[PDB]
Write a protein that binds this ligand. Structure first.
Ligand code: THR
Ligand code: CL
Ligand code: MG
Ligand code: MG
Lengths: 213, 122, 216
């Protein structure tokens, strides 16, 4: 199949700024390259057909360019309504394939997360399982590192993370990390620590509790 | 796409008010295709008049530019209804098909001449 | 005026079968190709079938060949995707769409198909509260962990909808057990941890369960 590779994964821009989105095909596809916009929970919306032809009714700020392997969607000056995911799609040959998308997200000033650790409840520890939760509240940009340390031992393979959509009012992200152990494994250890690395801080912040207290 | 479509006749002359019918011919087995009718602008822009089937994204269809598939499936009438003197110009058709790859091919161009109607002889 | 509307998505067991349908209006249905395109979480859009105007030609990618069949009923302005031998990897939003010379210029709304052997179960709701209620900080976080439910979704509110500011309800994660887990948190003035009560309200319609959990 033809593989389409979009770059960058995320563009972080302010309203009024120019957005340049790249789509590279694994083989030459002449002008058979189309562009779409997609917002959460919605179908994609067609913007550009045949690399450079603008669909009737699309704003003039959108324009497509390229031929062969290298294609570009340009948004000359971003409106708020333009923060969305953009996909390219080829119809050169079968199967018709899509790129992985570029997300155009809102720039705002750097905001360090507020960080909170929550021990497992006594109710849950009756059930035979311990969930330890680490909350990173209202940060920007999206890039973060959360590490769990239990009596200094770096944990791997026993946590899951979940991130909110960019907040409609303050443009930040929030993130949960959940560390899950059996009650038996949880009771072997004393100090539970969440270590968060983010651009808004000079160094990592460590939030911890002692299981005994 | 094995061959480009054909567009005939090369020169079509009609009297203003009458209809002018070209034929776009495109051999097909009813595998997906789009057939476009174009007129050249005075600045060499290919301007779309009509499509088979209709472009659902275009803002609407001028009623005077009609495309009719004939029974053999290969021949399409492309008709200017109630032709005007300022319909005189250069016309063509183009096809898009997808298998085994995508290709976009245009016909040779043809000329339409729409003449001035002669008055009753005084 | 041109519309496509999907029906049919839901839960299917691995190895099982599901049929989706798409109803068209506002254009000459038999004149156009019809398609299905799927979107799996974390995955690129994937075209999975096309049928020609007259139904004589069908196309599929190798990933669904022999399992999926696209068909249409031109008199009913509808097309269908019969999906056999479904696997975990087929879980996705399935969009009906209609291409025109290579690109998709009409789309449906998407219908979710979820492939799982899990049985319905209401969540366990646990409080998220700090080790110590005393804090040197102006702000405190509280929450509820909504664990081990199936299928999606749950609804979470706080104080019966009176508390909306500072609330973050996270997207669910699917655990290795095949059950979902999510947290809902809120940030509040530390001064209030004495006074005001904070209750998460967690509803799960598939199990007909409702939980209120006071957090301290
Ligand atoms: C006689 C008159 O009707 C005619 N048109 C002519 O000029 O000869
Ligand atoms: Cl607007
Ligand atoms: Mg988590
Ligand atoms: Mg469209």
């Amino acid at each position: 199949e033809i593989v389409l590779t979009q770059s960058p994964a995320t563009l972080s821009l302010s309203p009024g700024e120019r957005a340049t989105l790249s789509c590279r095909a694994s083989q030459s596809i002449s002008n058979f390259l189309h562009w779409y916009q997609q917002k959460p929970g919605q179908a994609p919306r067609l913007l550009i057909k045949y690399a450079s032809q603008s669909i009737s009714g699309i704003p003039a700020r959108f324009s497509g360019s390229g031929s062969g392997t290298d294609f570009t969607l340009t948004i000359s000056s971003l409106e708020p309504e333009d923060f969305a995911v953009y996909f390219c799609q080829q119809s050169n040959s079968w199967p018709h394939t899509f790129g992985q998308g570029t997300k155009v997200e809102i720039k705002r000033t750097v905001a360090a997360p507020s960080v909170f650790i929550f021990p497992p409840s006594d109710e849950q520890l009756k059930s035979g399982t311990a969930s330890v939760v680490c909350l990173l509240n209202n940060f920007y940009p999206r890039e973060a590192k959360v590490q769990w340390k239990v009596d200094n031992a770096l944990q791997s393979g026993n946590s899951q993370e979940s991130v909110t959509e960019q907040d409609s009012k303050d443009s930040t992200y929030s993130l949960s990390s959940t560390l899950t152990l059996s009650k038996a494994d949880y009771e072997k250890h004393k100090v539970y620590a969440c270590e968060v690395t983010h651009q808004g801080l000079s160094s990592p912040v460590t939030k911890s509790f002692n299981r005994g207290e | 796409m094995w061959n480009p479509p054909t567009f005939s006749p090369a020169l079509l002359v009609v009297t203003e008010g009458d209809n002018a019918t070209f034929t776009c011919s495109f051999s097909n087995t009813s595998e997906s295709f789009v057939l476009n009718w174009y007129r050249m602008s005075p600045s060499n822009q290919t301007d779309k008049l009509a499509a088979f089937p209709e472009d659902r994204s275009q803002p609407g269809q001028d009623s005077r530019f009609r495309v009719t598939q004939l029974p053999n499936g290969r021949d399409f009438h492309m008709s200017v209804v109630r032709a005007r003197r300022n319909d005189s110009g250069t016309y063509l058709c183009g096809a898009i098909s997808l298998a085994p790859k995508a290709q976009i091919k245009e016909s040779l161009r043809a000329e339409l001449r729409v003449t001035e109607r002669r008055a009753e002889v005084p | 005026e041109v519309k496509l509307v999907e029906s049919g998505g839901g839960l299917v067991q691995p190895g099982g079968s599901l049929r989706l349908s798409c109803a068209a209006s506002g254009f000459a249905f038999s004149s156009y190709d019809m398609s299905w395109v799927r979107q799996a979480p974390g995955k690129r859009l994937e075209w999975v079938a096309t049928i020609s105007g007259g139904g004589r030609y069908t196309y599929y990618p190798d990933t669904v060949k022999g399992r999926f069949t696209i068909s249409r009923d031109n008199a009913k302005n509808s097309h269908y995707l019969q999906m056999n031998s479904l696997r975990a990897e087929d879980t996705a939003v399935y969009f009906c769409a209609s291409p025109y010379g290579g690109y998709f210029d009409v789309w449906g709304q998407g219908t979710l198909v979820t492939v799982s052997s899990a049985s319905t179960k209401g969540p366990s709701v646990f409080p998220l509260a700090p080790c110590s209620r005393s804090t040197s900080e102006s702000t405190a976080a509280l929450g509820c962990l909504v664990k081990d439910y199936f299928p999606e979704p749950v609804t979470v509110s706080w104080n019966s909808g009176a508390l909306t500011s500072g609330v973050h309800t996270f997207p669910a994660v699917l655990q290795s057990s095949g059950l979902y887990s999510l947290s809902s948190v809120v940030t509040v003035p530390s001064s209030s941890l004495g006074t005001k009560t904070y209750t998460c309200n967690v509803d799960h319609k598939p199990s007909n369960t409702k939980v209120d959990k006071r957090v301290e």
